[PDB]
Design a protein around this ligand. Structure first.
Ligand code: 3ND
Lengths: 396, 383
């Protein structure tokens, strides 16, 4: 008998659970949204409903972590679907990074399921290689993800403010080789590696920060996707031959992007850069060929033997099997850090921060709020809030 | 009004069963959506499908932990009403024995009103009185609402009248049970022997409340539709086409009368007449002779509203000579022993209840209707 009443409470507390405390609220909350347009109030049932809750709900909405609870500093970042912000928690004066996503856009645009994989990970990954999620929540307009601010900055920027020396390269490349094995180990392929997505903390050490692609591999390391993902200059061959329906790839693809990282980093441009993106397509599939190099050998035998081992055909890429083989590769041989400690050592660059909110590594932005799209008032039920039902996550 | 602040204010709402948003309420809404959406006709909506994707199965498991009606062993239909029926049953798990009335979510919508059960639930469950039947559990599914209440082997007080030191006892208890209600801020609006039940110890409680209405701070109510049973309804409730608790006493007189007499003090071959009967309470009031105290009570309740025993202060009804006695006292009446005691064979003796023998089911929708929305929050696990 008591095989249930016990099994129940788990579900109502387990942050991993789809129906935990804050989840069930999101559903009730959402109803209250997707029904309170008078056009529907014309339904006895619907009316009788809003009557009973409306007010309660409103109060519940005052207690739950609302966007107001945050003080907006400056637009640290912005993307297709939303933007990232630096904020101080107006109560506990804590300072986080808060990414907003557009419930609107994400409906208009074909896909609105990518953020699940992200939240789950950033929040539970628990690893200094992954940025950390502290809170998540929604209104009728946005999803908000509150995260460990990274005073450090993107690595695309560090390559716009330096001329990375091979030693620095080895170090950055190794952290990324590590950061990824983390995600790999959680049964996820990243699927959009690139500087854009590698940030630094107060101590000039790297984590990854967008998971806007992340997909979980099956029991045998693979995935059955069938639409390309990432960024032109990085994506791998497999994920272009992706084109429904033969897409069938594993870990390996995330290493290819690594090659492109390592490349752009020492060189200065992507290994498949093209004045016409459409060209970068051909380039990538000709990796065997297209792979040129600076006629000025300003680089290592070890760096090359690495890169052209990553930027090789999937069937045969460093790491096709075992991360080990990438690690014990010549290029990483050195004596200033060791795999099992790299992060404890001292990053090639350290944050020259003036304060807790030194947004100097981040190129200032205009800061338009609410400007974009607005959901239409419907003539009947559509349930626009239903696929964001469960997003909310408080913890610690 | 502060992070640490509201976050306190929140927990309450999730824990206090009087709250509309308690744990068990939340679920009902999440559960209800899953019902009113799962119809193929709608799953043709991107969002609506993607949604049932994410929950449907989860919820299905949650429906197996929650107190499902399966959890109970059906005994026999001890009761039956227009909107459903009452049943005796043993909790298949902990073999306990309760009285589980069912309501028809279907009929309750087809029938113009579906709000009356809230008063009931609230009362039966929070009353905390020997005077009110108690509610242990409440819950629902796509078809019925269920109320698990303390069984009453005793029986209805109209059945007792088919088998005055006796009447002064019953009438007293009813006078007391009812003051409980009023003090809760409720005016029952449907007294009758049908709604009066007796416990293992021949003591009475009230059982139906699908009528009760909360009086405003002025002890008054602003209704304008008649409810109850014909032979009982009071005059002011018929002219309803604003008042207060006094009308619940009128019924009290109607009980005392039929109790002593044999039939209602406004009976009619054609109920229709009973209407004008009650309106002419002054006249119509006939008489077969028993007590001078009985009479002085009766024709003090069956008086015009503006002047009825208990206009204000129900103590005056108490201090009316009819109650003068020496075998019980107000502040003990229940402790005494009842004029009748349950001669039960066991825990499930449905002897005092006459054994009793459509079946409409909701229409599949061609769009969102939300027929389960008005019963969202019913569910009530109590302790
Ligand atoms: O401190 C941060 N802490 C966590 C995550 C984070 C993420 C980002 N943003 C990005 O990593 C991407 C990469 N290039 C565009 C930028 C971006 C901005 C908004 C969206 Cl919606 C998507 C992507 C920034 Cl800047 C800072 C932080």
């Amino acid at each position: 008998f008591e095989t249930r009443f016990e099994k129940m409470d788990n579900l109502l507390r387990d942050p991993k659970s789809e129906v935990n405390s804050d989840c069930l609220l999101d559903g009730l909350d959402a109803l209250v949204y997707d029904l309170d347009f008078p056009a529907l109030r014309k339904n006895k049932n619907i009316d009788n409903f809003l009557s009973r809750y409306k007010d309660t709900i409103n109060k519940i909405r005052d207690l739950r972590m609302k966007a107001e609870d945050y003080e907006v500093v400056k637009v640290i970042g912005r993307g297709a679907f939303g933007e990232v912000q630096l904020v101080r928690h107006k109560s506990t004066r804590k300072v986080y990074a808060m990414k907003l996503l557009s419930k609107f856009e994400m409906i208009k645009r074909s896909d609105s399921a990518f953020f699940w994989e992200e939240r789950d990970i950033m929040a539970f990954a628990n690893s200094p290689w992954v940025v950390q999620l502290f809170y998540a929540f929604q209104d009728d307009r946005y999803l908000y993800m509150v995260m460990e601010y990274m005073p450090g900055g993107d690595l695309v920027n560090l390559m716009s403010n330096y001329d990375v020396p091979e030693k620095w390269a080895r170090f950055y490349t190794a952290e990324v080789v590590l950061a990824l094995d983390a995600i790999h180990s959680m049964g996820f392929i990243h699927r959009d590696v690139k500087p854009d997505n590698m940030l630094l903390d107060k101590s000039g050490h790297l984590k990854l920060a967008d998971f806007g692609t992340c997909m979980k591999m099956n029991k045998e390391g693979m995935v059955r996707c069938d639409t390309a993902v990432g960024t032109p200059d990085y994506i791998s061959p497999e994920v272009l031959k992706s084109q429904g329906g033969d897409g069938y790839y594993g870990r390996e693809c995330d290493w290819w992007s690594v090659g492109v990282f390592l490349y752009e980093m020492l060189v200065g441009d992507t290994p498949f850069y093209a004045d016409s993106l459409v060209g970068t397509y051909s380039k990538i599939m000709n990796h065997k060929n297209s792979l040129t190099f600076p006629d000025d050998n300003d680089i290592s035998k070890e760096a090359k033997n690495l890169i052209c081992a990553f930027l090789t055909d999937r069937e045969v890429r460093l790491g096709r099997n075992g991360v080990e083989e990438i690690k014990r590769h010549l290029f990483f041989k050195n004596d200033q850090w060791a795999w099992e400690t790299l992060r404890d050592t001292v990053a090639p660059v350290v944050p020259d921060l003036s304060s807790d909110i030194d947004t100097s590594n981040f190129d200032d932005l205009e800061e338009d709020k609410g400007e974009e799209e607005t959901f239409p008032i419907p003539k009947a039920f559509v349930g626009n809030q239903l696929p964001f039902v469960g997003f909310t996550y408080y913890s610690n």
